[PDB]
Amino acid sequence: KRNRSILNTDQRNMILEEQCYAKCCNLFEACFNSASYRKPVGQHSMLEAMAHRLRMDARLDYESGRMSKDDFEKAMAHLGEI
Amino acid sequence: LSNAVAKMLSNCPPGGISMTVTGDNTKWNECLNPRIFLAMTERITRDSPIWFRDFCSIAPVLFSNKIARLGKGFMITSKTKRLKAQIPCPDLFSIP
Amino acid sequence: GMTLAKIELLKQLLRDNEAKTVLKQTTVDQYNIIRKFNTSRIEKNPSLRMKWAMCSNFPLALTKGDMANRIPLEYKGIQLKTNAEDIGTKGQMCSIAAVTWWNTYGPIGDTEGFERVYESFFLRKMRLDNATWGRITFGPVERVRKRVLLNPLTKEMPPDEASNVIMEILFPKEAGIPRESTWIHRELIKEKREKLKGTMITPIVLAYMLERELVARRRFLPVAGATSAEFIEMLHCLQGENWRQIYHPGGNKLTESRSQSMIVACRKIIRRSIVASNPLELAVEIANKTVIDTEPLKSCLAAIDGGDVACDIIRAALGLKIRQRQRFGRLELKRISGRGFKNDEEILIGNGTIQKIGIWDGEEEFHVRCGECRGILKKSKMKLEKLLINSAKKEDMRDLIILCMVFSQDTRMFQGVRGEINFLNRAGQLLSPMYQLQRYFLNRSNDLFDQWGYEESPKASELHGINESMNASDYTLKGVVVTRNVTEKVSITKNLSLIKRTGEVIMGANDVSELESQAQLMITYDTPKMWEMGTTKELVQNTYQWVLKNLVTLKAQFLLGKEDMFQWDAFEAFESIIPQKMAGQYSGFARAVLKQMRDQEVMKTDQFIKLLPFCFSPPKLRSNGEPYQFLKLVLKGGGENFIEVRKGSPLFSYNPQTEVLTICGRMMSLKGKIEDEERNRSMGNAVLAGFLVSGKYDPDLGDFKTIEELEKLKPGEKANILLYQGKPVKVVK
Amino acid sequence: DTVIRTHEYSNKGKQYISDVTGCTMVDPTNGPLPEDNEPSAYAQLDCVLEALDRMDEEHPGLFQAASQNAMETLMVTTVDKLTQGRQTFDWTVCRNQPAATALNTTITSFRLNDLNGADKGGLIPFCQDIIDSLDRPEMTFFSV
Amino acid sequence: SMDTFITRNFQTTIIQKAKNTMAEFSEDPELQPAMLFNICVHLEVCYVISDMNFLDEEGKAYTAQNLRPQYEVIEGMPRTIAWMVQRSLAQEHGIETPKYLADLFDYKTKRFIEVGITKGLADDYFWKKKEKLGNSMELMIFSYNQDYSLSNESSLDEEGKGRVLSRLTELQAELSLKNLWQVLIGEEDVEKGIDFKLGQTISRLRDISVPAGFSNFEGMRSYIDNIDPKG
RNA sequence: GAAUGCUAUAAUAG
RNA sequence: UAUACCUCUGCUUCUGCUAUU
RNA sequence: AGUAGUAACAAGAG
Ligand SMILES: Nc1ccn([C@@H]2O[C@H](COP(=O)(O)OP(=O)(O)OP(=O)(O)O)[C@@H](O)[C@H]2O)c(=O)n1
């Protein structure tokens, strides 16, 4: 367990900053499993990378038959909002 | 070092004496100068392009104007009262 | 249908405008920076912090999940976990007792594929399991510090190539640009992918497990006659400084590693056999009982088709068809005609430095081969003459030409060396210049081709030359041709020379490589006195030890018979580590200094012990009857392998105060085996042959005379000598 | 102690006031040669160069051979290279912090001063932003 | 110059997404506008081929609620996204990935499409790019002199084939109307020097960071460079 | 009859 | 002030560089 | 008190 001396002092706030970056990375790693292994390279936005991958994944999940119309519409609609 | 000793040992002139000075320099950090390290890069990168000559030159130049932070400070106490207090480095010349 | 969930979570995450802006601003590159972002200062005293933290109630942090919830809060009045969630895992914290509980009454997970996943290790175990342990030996071991492979690999690749293969196995989509490598390991990719297919172990682990058995872990270690990874892994049990242990691993052993070691055995046999009369006798004697790991040398030489001169000499000596088959790493040759004379010369190279290389004289013809491509080569001293080849594979043809170009040692090849080429290692060790020049021009070929020169192609029947791009071209490389078209009973002299049935010699023990090197597999000699094939320091120590052992007799026999006890099998071995071109001269010197002690009453046991071994090589005196005079006696190996006549040396020094002789570090007591008069009796006498002390330093005589100035004196002439710093002596002839 | 001793071995050198920082600067180099065996920082450029010339003669091409490698490295070197140096000093909070954070703070801070060199990914353009950041009249940074 | 031209002709989508492609190749958009225009046209041509091309749930092409096109625009998308998309498609439909990066991909054809714009002859440029690919991607070459060279199996319809050749000549005319057609004709070469210039502050710091007996850094540099201190 | 160059949270060294 | 015989904390009260990798 | 030793702990915080 992490030393919790930080809970008493005002540095507390940094835990939210951490658990933000954590949320961002952790999800990114669900999109790109290779990221965990080898350093991902790109000067473009993370969101940009994540979006396209999920779009392809969803499209090919529909075309392959891993995903249904109801779910695919929801996918393209939700991805649309970004 | 084993290979180095072996040669420098055997290369000794016959009849002549080979001597090893187990050495150590005093105040290595305090005595060495950044402006010398600057000269070293300038002399080492002589055939390197203009940008890389300059790039190397920065690190010494920063060190030749560097500022040392003075840590936490000094703790002042009264034994009679049983009171202790840390004096911040900015407030070093606050008290006589 | 994991895709939907991720998209649904992205919408949740993007509602946090802080997260939104992080995702929108932080680049894919910068992921690497924010991934490592944390509050936690690095734990500097973990040994302590652990020992302390283990005494706390809830030291460990569960990962928030349905499994974490399968652990009960307390068990039989033991608080296993708390409600309070860790800062990191954002899951319940627990005591070490939790683990012990889970491992006892927890759910039984599916351990399918585990063995295939962790095969790398299971093999590591299997090798120890199916091993055979021999005998422990107590004696000196000269450990050499060399860069070795720590763990046997499935297939060796550069880290870059290795990583790209792992990507193709585990993460197909995020692979990037397809490389040649992808096709080169197509078998291994599919094979691994089919083995790791059904597994619940985390891909990131499978990554590092493959990385472990594809990426080479290669580091410096002190080794002794064992380089092979499957030996190195066990190096701790193989030997110490002062003891050796025979260990045969399991699984398989490579024919190449079987070969490369098999050479060192032969070279080591020959190197030692050369000193005895009837070298063939000893060569045969040892070879019959020389075991390579578990495989007899004779069986190995018979089984393997390849090896060097030494292998053929020993093959003949044993009675096996000598294969004049030859290798140069990738290139593999076989001599048709020619006789090679290896002369060490100072070659200038294209970058503009002078490297010492062994250059071969005479015009020779070889049957050159490289993969599916074959050819006939013709070369003279540092010049390729003619190269005939087949039109097999495009790269196999391309490699053979580069290998043949380098092998020929053409002054044009040395001209095309542009850039950094390391002949010396980071640790100031020698790398084989030809084997590094071979290795360099296989990477940068376009330089060699352009730095060689072209000419008109041949206009013969089936001869059509090829240019840089390896296509049937008008301009071909100067003395290169492509064609459509692709033993004899020997005997060996006792002195080790391979004579034809006519009379002309094909090889001799004078033609074998002088370079000793660490055998890949463990070389064993099943005859007593195996130490005779040992290193300089090993032989030196084992000899003086045997001198000390039998000093009782050997010293007495010397005072009765003069040269009766100079001929001893120990001193024979000892000769094989003396430079042959000073061996006789040293014996000439030593015997005179010994006889000088016996006859003129002035004895010195520490000196007797020191010099006695040198007195084996038939004496070699100067032309004026008197022996050669020496200060130090240099031996084979490093510049520390020498015996000082006047002082002590890194191999041999005597301490009179303690009466303690020191040999290669090992300390032996000369207490009891020392005369009463010796203590006060000066050394000055047993330092130069036909020279004895008269008095102390005489300033009238001037400075101290050198070996030369001493040798050039008429009998009954005084001189000033220095034995060691602050011991001046007045010595007369 | 270090601060005193450093200047104690340089005190006979050239002392001046930095018209950049406003600080007290001392320059021993090319200073008067020592009269005793007390630690001397008074190194002589000429002798440092002469020493390096001999080294260059003894090891020909090594300087440019290294410079080449060191340069060709820097071009490949990313920014994340800085995130492997334990506790680095963070100027935004004037305390030590993890290398990875100390960088992140600086990158986030730089963006506010119109310095996106980091985003390009190479170390060089990020370094450009550092020597540029000195010329900014004011420097703005987040503090919670 | 081309600076003011591309602002009028092409949208910010095409302007930026090309400048990203140039940025990834690490070449200045302003110092080589000829290279920018080429990739701009290259990208604008590709979008027109996949603009209104839509697929229904039955699996047939139609012209345009519905979010699933017939083609997949790879040109424009950053390298590591483009390659992810390219690999994802190949591995899914079950074909080998081309060693070179493709431009388009037809979901109905299940084949990669390489697009190429040329100055001279489109028929010549077809056989030029046949050496690299061979039959990995179904080529679709175009040029400004109304000359089209597609593969034996071309999905591009008559109403679609026009819009390309229209916009090809429409722009080619607009470049001639502004006397900027000549700017693309002439050859343009420049090696991107890795320039690292120092600011005002750091430059001053360097000048005060010099040994005694030097006016400025320039002195120390030239002294070290020039004079030999033997003896 | 040679190589293959790397790059820890420990410890040691300066 | 009071809650407080309460609550939270036990490297975070500044732990560096370079090698062995 | 004591630990300890060129300066600290001998609880700190809401
Ligand atoms: N923990 C350490 C120890 C040593 N060094 C480096 O190694 C040098 C030599 O340290 P040492 O020989 O222990 O001391 P000196 O600097 O010679 O100091 P003194 O005059 O007291 O001998 C230091 O100056 C410093 O560059 C370091 O960085 N960190």
Ligand SMILES: [Mg+2]
């Ligand atoms: Mg010191």
